[PDB]
Structures are given as structure tokens and as C-alpha cells.
Amino acid sequence: QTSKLKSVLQDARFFLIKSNNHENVSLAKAKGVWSTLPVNEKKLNLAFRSARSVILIFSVRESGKFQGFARLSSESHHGGSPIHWVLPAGMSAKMLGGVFKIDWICRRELPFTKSAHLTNPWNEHKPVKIGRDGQEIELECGTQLCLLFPPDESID
RNA sequence: UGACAC
16 A cells, blocks of 8 residues: 555645756755745645645656655745755756755655656646646646655665 | 756
């Protein structure tokens, strides 16, 4: 069975998160928080109240593989210092700082070959690895991704 | 409005 995690997959909204470097994803799991473009933080903040739960799926541009997924624990923060994100070329911190708490359901990576049979109809019907940051994935599509993640038992 | 698949 999928343990208590299944409780989210029955009604949660899934979101495709991208990153320009593996360092932002690695830093986000080391901090237990995340940040993204202000148009995406808005979609995640509004999805938080309208859904039973929100799930953020992590990915890197050059990797094409998923680095993990985590449940949005809270809305974006403000009035305090931001996280030390690794800003890629042409990026600036002014688009960030809306840092939100997240709960890592799995720290492990997952190659797209396991999810190759999946596609997002809430998009151009393209595979789950394509599409921009903040793209909303279908309820049952993103659910299936959570079922095909490997166990994090490699950590200990 | 600024982290698509390569």
C-alpha cells in the first residue's frame, strides 16, 4: 500500500517545478523550502486553499529526470531574508523570496522512462517532463508519478 | 513575465 501518502493523491493538485541547476533542488531539500517565479508562486498559493493538498514535482532542465516531489506545507513567506538560491544567468532575486515550506515525500530521483506512458491533458498532451515551471499536472497523472517513485531507503 | 522537452 502507498501508506498515509495516498491521502494526498486522492484530491491533491500536482505542479511541475523546474530548475536551471541541480543545486537549487539540493538546497531546497536541505532547507525544507522552495521558491519560484512570482507567476508560479501565485498558482501554488491559490491551489493551496482550493485543493486538499498541493504536490510540487522537482526537475532540472539539463537532467530531464525528476529529482523528487514534496507537499506544499504553507503559503509563500515575506518580511524576512530569502533563501540563498543559486541564481542562474539572467535571473535575479526580485522574482524570488516568496519562500514556502514543503514536506519531502521522497528524496530520490526518478528517470522519465518509468513515467513515459504518462502525459498531461491539462497541457498540450505532452509527456510529464515537458512544459514550463508551474505547469499544473492532472490529478490522476501526477498521482501515478508518486506511485512509481523508488524508496528513500538508500539514505540509511 | 524571469529555471520547456534537448
